[PDB]
Design a protein around this ligand. Sequence first.
Ligand SMILES: *[C@@H]1O[C@H](CO)[C@@H](O[C@@H]2O[C@H](CO)[C@@H](O[C@@H]3O[C@H](CO[C@H]4O[C@H](CO[C@H]5O[C@H](CO)[C@@H](O)[C@H](O)[C@@H]5O)[C@@H](O)[C@H](O[C@H]5O[C@H](CO)[C@@H](O)[C@H](O)[C@@H]5O)[C@@H]4O)[C@@H](O)[C@H](O[C@H]4O[C@H](CO)[C@@H](O)[C@H](O)[C@@H]4O[C@H]4O[C@H](CO)[C@@H](O)[C@H](O)[C@@H]4O[C@H]4O[C@H](CO)[C@@H](O)[C@H](O)[C@@H]4O)[C@@H]3O)[C@H](O)[C@H]2NC(C)=O)[C@H](O)[C@H]1NC(C)=O
Ligand SMILES: *[C@@H]1O[C@H](CO)[C@@H](O[C@@H]2O[C@H](CO)[C@@H](O[C@@H]3O[C@H](CO[C@H]4O[C@H](CO)[C@@H](O)[C@H](O)[C@@H]4O)[C@@H](O)[C@H](O[C@H]4O[C@H](CO)[C@@H](O)[C@H](O)[C@@H]4O)[C@@H]3O)[C@H](O)[C@H]2NC(C)=O)[C@H](O)[C@H]1NC(C)=O
Ligand SMILES: *[C@@H]1O[C@H](CO)[C@@H](O[C@@H]2O[C@H](CO)[C@@H](O)[C@H](O)[C@H]2NC(C)=O)[C@H](O)[C@H]1NC(C)=O
Ligand SMILES: *[C@@H]1O[C@H](CO)[C@@H](O[C@@H]2O[C@H](CO)[C@@H](O)[C@H](O)[C@H]2NC(C)=O)[C@H](O)[C@H]1NC(C)=O
Ligand SMILES: *[C@@H]1O[C@H](CO)[C@@H](O)[C@H](O)[C@H]1NC(C)=O
Ligand SMILES: *[C@@H]1O[C@H](CO)[C@@H](O)[C@H](O)[C@H]1NC(C)=O
Ligand SMILES: *[C@@H]1O[C@H](CO)[C@@H](O)[C@H](O)[C@H]1NC(C)=O
Ligand SMILES: *[C@@H]1O[C@H](CO)[C@@H](O)[C@H](O)[C@H]1NC(C)=O
Ligand SMILES: *[C@@H]1O[C@H](CO)[C@@H](O)[C@H](O)[C@H]1NC(C)=O
Ligand SMILES: *[C@@H]1O[C@H](CO)[C@@H](O)[C@H](O)[C@H]1NC(C)=O
Lengths: 121, 49, 133, 46, 108, 96
Amino acid sequence: QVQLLQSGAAVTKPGASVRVSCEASGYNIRDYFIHWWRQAPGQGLQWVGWINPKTGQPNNPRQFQGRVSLTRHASWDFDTYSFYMDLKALRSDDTAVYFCARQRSDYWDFDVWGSGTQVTV
Amino acid sequence: IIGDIRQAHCNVSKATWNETLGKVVKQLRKHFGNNTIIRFANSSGGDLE
Amino acid sequence: QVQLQESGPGLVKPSETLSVTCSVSGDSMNNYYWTWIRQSPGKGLEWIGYISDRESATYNPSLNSRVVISRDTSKNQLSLKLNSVTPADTAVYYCATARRGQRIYGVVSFGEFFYYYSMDVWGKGTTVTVSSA
Amino acid sequence: TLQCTNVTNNITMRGELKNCSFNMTTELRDKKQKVYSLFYRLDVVQ
Amino acid sequence: YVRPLSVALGETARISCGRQALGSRAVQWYQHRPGQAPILLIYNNQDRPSGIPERFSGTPDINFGTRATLTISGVEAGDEADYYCHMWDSRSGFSWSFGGATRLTVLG
Amino acid sequence: DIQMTQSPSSLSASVGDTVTITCQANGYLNWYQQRRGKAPKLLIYDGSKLERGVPSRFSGRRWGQEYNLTINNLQPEDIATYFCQVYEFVVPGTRL
Ligand SMILES: *[C@@H]1O[C@H](CO)[C@@H](O[C@@H]2O[C@H](CO)[C@@H](O[C@@H]3O[C@H](CO[C@H]4O[C@H](CO[C@H]5O[C@H](CO)[C@@H](O)[C@H](O)[C@@H]5O)[C@@H](O)[C@H](O[C@H]5O[C@H](CO)[C@@H](O)[C@H](O)[C@@H]5O)[C@@H]4O)[C@@H](O)[C@H](O[C@H]4O[C@H](CO)[C@@H](O)[C@H](O)[C@@H]4O[C@H]4O[C@H](CO)[C@@H](O)[C@H](O)[C@@H]4O[C@H]4O[C@H](CO)[C@@H](O)[C@H](O)[C@@H]4O)[C@@H]3O)[C@H](O)[C@H]2NC(C)=O)[C@H](O)[C@H]1NC(C)=O
Ligand SMILES: *[C@@H]1O[C@H](CO)[C@@H](O[C@@H]2O[C@H](CO)[C@@H](O[C@@H]3O[C@H](CO[C@H]4O[C@H](CO)[C@@H](O)[C@H](O)[C@@H]4O)[C@@H](O)[C@H](O[C@H]4O[C@H](CO)[C@@H](O)[C@H](O)[C@@H]4O)[C@@H]3O)[C@H](O)[C@H]2NC(C)=O)[C@H](O)[C@H]1NC(C)=O
Ligand SMILES: *[C@@H]1O[C@H](CO)[C@@H](O[C@@H]2O[C@H](CO)[C@@H](O)[C@H](O)[C@H]2NC(C)=O)[C@H](O)[C@H]1NC(C)=O
Ligand SMILES: *[C@@H]1O[C@H](CO)[C@@H](O[C@@H]2O[C@H](CO)[C@@H](O)[C@H](O)[C@H]2NC(C)=O)[C@H](O)[C@H]1NC(C)=O
Ligand SMILES: *[C@@H]1O[C@H](CO)[C@@H](O)[C@H](O)[C@H]1NC(C)=O
Ligand SMILES: *[C@@H]1O[C@H](CO)[C@@H](O)[C@H](O)[C@H]1NC(C)=O
Ligand SMILES: *[C@@H]1O[C@H](CO)[C@@H](O)[C@H](O)[C@H]1NC(C)=O
Ligand SMILES: *[C@@H]1O[C@H](CO)[C@@H](O)[C@H](O)[C@H]1NC(C)=O
Ligand SMILES: *[C@@H]1O[C@H](CO)[C@@H](O)[C@H](O)[C@H]1NC(C)=O
Ligand SMILES: *[C@@H]1O[C@H](CO)[C@@H](O)[C@H](O)[C@H]1NC(C)=O
């Protein structure tokens, strides 16, 4: 039942803005953080940041400040959410696939992931 | 509103704030390196609360 | 010490241009604002506009900007230009200065202040009459 | 539904307070009164 | 629209304009004889320029909730002029009109 | 501070043996299995604790600052990429 829906792929130009969605349905969303991961073709994973679903406060590394803006949206009955990820100005080396993890406990257990959204520039 | 239309604000002492923040950066270097650069930025987002 | 003295044409036809020139001596135009004041018999004083130092001309919105003024340092003369004179200007003009006073009532950093203008020294002035003869 | 107008004349914050008028229920529930109140910008949406 | 006022010799003249202040004010009092140039009397509610004797005084803007009154200690027969009230307010925006004139008349 | 080391860069051992990959890191450490073009899947967390849904042929243990992943009874569907994951630091894992 615990699933994280993933949005479809998108092709843009260098300088545009993208948006990747993530919908969590079958668990208690407000008690578990939602992280974002990105891996380039040929390399390993790379951390993008987390967002508190209760408050909305994001976190991002120094190499991503000013570009990525993590935003969540809750429904009226608070059973499903919509986690977004907007990039301000995509570079040429941003052609990668983005995931939607879920922190379970303090050991950072990402048990459930997303299907993945690959974007190119 | 009887009077002028003004904006609510708050005031802190700038001499006291640098003295207080100068002690937190001294105690923060015990859990990190001795020659690290400690910055202070504003909030990143969320709701207004 | 600044002295003001103006001279007008005196006679003006309807639907015709208008030019009243004011001569000022004693000091330059470095910190001195200038304005035009009109007074008709039967009513009070009427402010029509003023000129700043950086050539930013604003006028009275009740006249829908039918006048335009200018001034220069090479001639030390300021004048007024008016087109389509409605026959209601049977009045007397005044050439006076102005001072830019700042009234602060709140926080300066939030823009909680307003500017007020006061006419320190005035001029004698002359009157015009629109006649159909 | 409200009918909100601005309060501050000289624009620069112009738009923080709203002068909203609306139809409120009277203590006799067959008539209505037209009252007005001041609301902040964070409490109203278009 | 000019309003009359009759003040005899010996007493003081209390001129108050009809324009009310919706906040912090800084009024200007003028004196215009018919045919003569207008004379500035009071600016910033208390200040008198060079050429004004100790006859006129204005109410300061302290503890807002009061009115603007131009008091004249000593009436003179040569004061047959109009007294304007150029009200500058923080909430009324820019003031382009001088308001109304109070034609002070002296008896005797 | 977090320090990472990954010495088994590449190995292509056969089926039926017992292979082990190690990585030295301080703090909590989770193990993930990632296929080609698919999402990673958590196998074990906290070094030795097993996740529900993972078959019992996976096991791990720690001793100081050395975490091991024991792979016994290999399968034709158990060839993928494996990496150990500290909080925000993920090293590029190795393929079988
Ligand atoms: C958080 O922090 C922020 C700062 O970051 C705080 O914000 C500040 O907040 C205060 C109030 O909240 C604001 O103040 C008002 O300030 C104005 C301006 O003050 C200045 O200008 C005056 C005039 O300057 C003229 O003279 C100078 C030469 O001196 C000349 O260069 C210039 O061109 C001009 O011609 C100065 O006199 C005045 O000095 C004062 O400062 C001296 C030095 O500190 C001090 O020694 C003096 O004793 C005097 O205090 C200052 O530089 C004030 O004008 C204003 O006062 C008026 O308006 C309110 C409206 O309700 C009224 O109630 C007051 O009574 C006062 O009314 C007077 O002034 C009018 C104009 O002159 C006059 O028309 C009125 O009749 C009235 O006159 C009365 O009383 C005084 C008493 O001494 C008397 O001398 C007069 O003759 C007259 O009778 C307010 O005070 C700040 O602007 C603001 N920003 C800053 C500081 O950057 C905030 O408050 C903090 N919040 C908290 C919670 O802590
Ligand atoms: C934490 O600290 C940072 C940095 O100190 C603050 O950042 C700035 O945030 C403000 C508020 O959003 C930004 O201001 C505005 O920019 C928007 C987008 O920008 C264009 O214009 C700006 C210049 O204003 C350029 O820098 C930028 O590259 C874009 O070209 C505008 O849409 C906004 O317009 C709004 O204001 C106008 C009036 O000016 C209205 O008419 C509009 O309707 C609209 O309301 C505004 O101009 C600012 O650009 C940010 N700077 C940087 C460097 O990022 C954070 O705000 C702060 N956080 C908190 C919570 O305090
Ligand atoms: C209740 O009404 C508010 C007012 O519009 C809705 O809020 C906004 O949602 C739209 C659609 O995403 C955004 O474009 C606006 O920017 C939102 N407004 C604010 C102030 O954030 C809200 O979604 C409505 N509630 C529900 C459950 O739909
Ligand atoms: C309060 O209710 C009255 C009706 O009971 C509203 O008045 C009408 O508003 C419609 C809206 O277009 C107009 O067409 C009518 O001409 C109005 N009738 C009258 C008699 O005014 C009124 O607008 C309501 N108040 C508010 C603030 O909406
Ligand atoms: C705060 O106000 C008190 C008195 O109200 C004053 O003594 C103190 O100096 C003020 N502090 C600041 C930082 O304005
Ligand atoms: C804070 O104020 C003190 C005052 O002595 C100054 O030395 C210091 O550089 C200030 N800090 C910053 C970050 O500006
Ligand atoms: C860091 O600085 C402190 C000063 O209080 C010192 O005691 C400590 O030995 C320093 N650390 C190292 C590794 O030298
Ligand atoms: C109120 O002010 C805001 C900003 O100045 C403007 O966008 C809006 O149209 C104004 N509304 C009215 C009714 O004047
Ligand atoms: C981990 O495995 C290596 C060989 O792959 C072995 O040398 C080492 O002793 C093992 N460590 C533990 C703690 O089992
Ligand atoms: C912090 O977490 C690490 C494991 O990531 C653990 O070894 C350490 O004891 C923890 N610190 C505290 C104070 O609990």
